[PDB]
Design a protein around this motif. Structure first.
Motif, PDB file in Angstrom:
ATOM      1  N   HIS A   1      41.049  37.375  36.294  1.00  0.00           N
ATOM      2  CA  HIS A   1      39.621  37.130  36.011  1.00  0.00           C
ATOM      3  C   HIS A   1      39.275  37.682  34.639  1.00  0.00           C
ATOM      4  O   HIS A   1      39.824  38.710  34.242  1.00  0.00           O
ATOM      5  CB  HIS A   1      38.746  37.768  37.087  1.00  0.00           C
ATOM      6  CG  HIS A   1      38.942  37.241  38.482  1.00  0.00           C
ATOM      7  ND1 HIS A   1      38.089  36.330  39.017  1.00  0.00           N
ATOM      8  CD2 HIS A   1      39.784  37.601  39.486  1.00  0.00           C
ATOM      9  CE1 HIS A   1      38.417  36.100  40.293  1.00  0.00           C
ATOM     10  NE2 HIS A   1      39.495  36.853  40.603  1.00  0.00           N
TER      11      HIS A   1
ATOM     12  N   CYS B   1      44.175  40.193  40.156  1.00  0.00           N
ATOM     13  CA  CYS B   1      43.481  39.979  41.449  1.00  0.00           C
ATOM     14  C   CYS B   1      44.415  39.235  42.394  1.00  0.00           C
ATOM     15  O   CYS B   1      45.270  38.490  41.924  1.00  0.00           O
ATOM     16  CB  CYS B   1      42.158  39.222  41.250  1.00  0.00           C
ATOM     17  SG  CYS B   1      41.057  39.209  42.715  1.00  0.00           S
TER      18      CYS B   1
ATOM     19  N   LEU C   1      33.530  42.097  39.857  1.00  0.00           N
ATOM     20  CA  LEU C   1      33.417  40.630  39.897  1.00  0.00           C
ATOM     21  C   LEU C   1      31.996  40.312  40.362  1.00  0.00           C
ATOM     22  O   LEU C   1      31.400  41.167  41.052  1.00  0.00           O
ATOM     23  CB  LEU C   1      34.418  40.024  40.895  1.00  0.00           C
ATOM     24  CG  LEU C   1      35.904  40.310  40.654  1.00  0.00           C
ATOM     25  CD1 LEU C   1      36.760  39.585  41.669  1.00  0.00           C
ATOM     26  CD2 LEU C   1      36.317  39.888  39.256  1.00  0.00           C
TER      27      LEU C   1
HETATM   28 ZN   LIG Z   1      40.312  36.970  42.420  1.00  0.00          ZN
END
Ligand SMILES: [Zn+2]
Ligand SMILES: Cc1ccc(NC(=O)[C@@H]2CCCO2)nc1
Ligand SMILES: [Zn+2]
Length: 580
Positions: A409, A423, A528
């Motif tokens: 990300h 991730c 996130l």
């Molecule tokens: Zn992710």
């Protein structure tokens, strides 16, 4: 055949002369079989109670709880000999690639001293238990090294007596520590001197660390070209051909003296000819042999897999660029054209790849790569979960590409600086942290393994709401001074303050971060998006998760009560919601 493996085979016979028998009901088609003898023996996955008591919501999530419960019909397969044109492409590319990798490196023997220090700090060298208990004890005993000497002088003679594999989509081939030494002595330089670093190999990521992989893929994405391809091979180690093993052995062309002879012997006697013992319940020990497939130590396996994958992907790039017309036969002038491509654009084409053993990501010049399948199939590197002649599906966004079991990300800090973070689905992260391997774990050792997972989460997965909270809980529940333990770069294995380590890894030492202003608190470090965190498996929004978060000090206190009256720190007020 038997002039190279006979002696290993002869010697095993005599140690079980009471029990030897050429069983006629042997299951082997592709392995050569020699005989059988009497044995009787097998290590399940155990739960980490410290991590489980502090992740209660996950006790009712089957994707987590099933991980702790519970193909050898792929090892007993064969790979066809590649065509003449394919064999030529591989030899030219391999010769050129060892030269490139050797330009700024010097092959050299690894030392008893180096091997001794490795064992005395727990590295998974894939040895067996006999005469001494552990690896630590064999290395401190001069008798062992005389066994090593006997074998070593046998290898200089071009013969082998004791280098035998023991079998156990995975297959780990343990040898006795002595055989592992001799492998490490001859070929340890590949790993020890970072031959597959990105600086040295251009495609490699050896030693890079999970905090760098996302930035590396984003740098590949910046190149002009087609989609990003990330095709997995079906059972890479089982598709390594004798032709592959011969191109790998050309590293010895860069060696001299003793080292050259010692390395030629590992390749000839243990890699291009192998002797293996397998437990068959029908319980006997089978002594089988074959010439091909991968069966080396896991660290040498990593470097040679990276080498052969880099070679294979360059050839698939050549096919898409129309450098050669057919794998049936390379003409004289196609040979010059292949050589000329490598000299002219080889290094550029290596920089279009990220390669970690059998795992690759390629951003080719254009999408002709997608349907360039003849060399790849003929080399035996058949793609997983797609029909042999169906064109590859590429990725249009580097943030969607799978690599090393992760995706990446782009995360913007409140101050505008850009993090690229690793991730994966959060069920896989929590399910793995809940597992220990091996027996005789004390409560202290179990706690220190939980702390290692918690510290990794703080450093690599801080952007996942549930993992920053569970990491803070575990670090609050384990005595502050207890040292994280485990049985690429592991920056979380330390008793230093994790905010200081975060600053060093993501800011100070991060070459993609121009502004070096330190972060002063965990609240400056972003998550996130809430919806993205849910997409990647967060329980944020569930009743079970809200009760866990609100009552976390009660869970922390349950674990502190079990461990007893020790010095603990409260890390929960590092989070806004617990900061009063
Ligand atoms: Zn992710
Ligand atoms: C090339 C490369 C570098 C790092 C990693 N993975 C990790 O560091 C962690 C440790 C536990 C599993 O993931 N994987 C591949
Ligand atoms: Zn040997």
């Amino acid at each position: 055949n038997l002039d190279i493996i006979g002696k290993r085979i002869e010697k095993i016979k005599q140690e079980h002369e009471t029990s030897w028998h050429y069983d006629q009901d042997h299951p082997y088609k592709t392995w050569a079989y020699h005989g059988s003898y009497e044995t009787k023996q097998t290590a399940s996955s155990m739960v980490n109670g410290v991590v489980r008591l502090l992740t209660k919501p996950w006790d009712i999530i089957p994707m987590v709880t099933q991980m702790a419960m519970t193909f050898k019909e792929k090892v007993d397969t064969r790979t066809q000999e590649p065509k003449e044109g394919t064999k030529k492409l591989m030899k030219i590319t391999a010769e050129w690639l060892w030269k490139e990798l050797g330009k700024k490196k010097t092959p050299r023997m690894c030392t008893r001293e180096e091997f001794t220090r490795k064992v005395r700090s727990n590295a998974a060298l894939g040895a067996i238990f006999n005469k001494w208990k552990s690896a630590r004890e064999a290395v401190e005993d001069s008798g062992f090294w005389e066994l090593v000497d006997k074998e070593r002088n046998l290898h200089l003679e071009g013969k082998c007596e004791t280098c035998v594999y023991n079998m156990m989509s995975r297959a780990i081939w343990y040898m006795w520590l002595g055989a592992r030494f001799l492998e490490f002595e001859a070929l340890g330089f590949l790993n020890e001197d970072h031959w597959f670093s990105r600086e040295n190999s251009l495609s490699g990521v050896e030693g890079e660390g999970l905090h760098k992989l996302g930035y590396i893929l984003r740098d590949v994405s910046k190149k002009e070209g087609g989609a990003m391809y990330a095709d997995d091979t079906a059972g890479w180690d089982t598709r390594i051909t004798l032709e592959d093993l011969k191109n790998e052995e050309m590293v010895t062309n860069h060696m001299e003296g003793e080292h050259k002879k010692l390395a030629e012997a590992i390749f000839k006697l243990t890699y291009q000819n192998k002797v293996v013992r397998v437990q068959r319940p029908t319980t006997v020990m089978d002594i089988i042999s074959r010439r091909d497939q991968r069966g080396s130590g896991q660290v040498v396996t990593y470097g040679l897999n990276t080498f052969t994958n880099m070679e294979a992907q360059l050839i698939r790039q050549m096919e898409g660029e129309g450098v050669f017309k057919s794998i049936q036969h390379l003409t004289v002038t196609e040979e010059i054209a292949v050589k000329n491509w490598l000299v002219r654009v080889g290094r550029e084409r290596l920089s279009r790849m990220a390669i970690s053993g059998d795992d690759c990501v390629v951003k080719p010049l254009d999408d002709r790569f997608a349907s360039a399948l003849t060399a790849l199939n003929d080399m035996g590197k058949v793609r997983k979960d797609i029909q042999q002649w169906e064109p590859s599906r590429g990725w249009n966004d580097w943030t969607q590409v799978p690599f090393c079991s992760h995706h990446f990300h782009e995360l913007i800090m409140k101050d505008g600086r850009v993090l690229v973070v690793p991730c994966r689905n959060q069920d896989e992260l929590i399910g793995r942290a809940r597992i220990s391997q091996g027996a005789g774990w004390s409560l202290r050792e179990t706690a220190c393994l939980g702390k290692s997972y918690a510290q990794m989460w703080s450093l690599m997965y801080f952007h996942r709401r549930d993992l920053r909270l569970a990491a803070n809980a575990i670090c609050s529940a384990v005595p502050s001074h207890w040292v994280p333990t485990s049985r690429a770069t592991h920056e979380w294995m330390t008793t230093e303050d994790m905010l200081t380590v975060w600053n060093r890894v993501w800011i100070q030492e991060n070459p993609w971060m121009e502004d070096k202003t330190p972060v002063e608190s965990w609240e400056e470090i972003p998550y996130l998006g809430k919806r993205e965190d849910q997409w990647c498996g967060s329980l944020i929004g569930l009743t079970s998760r809200a009760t866990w978060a609100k009552n976390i000090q009660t869970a922390i206190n349950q674990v502190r009560s079990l461990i007893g009256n020790e010095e603990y720190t409260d890390y929960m007020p590092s989070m806004k919601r617990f900061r009063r």
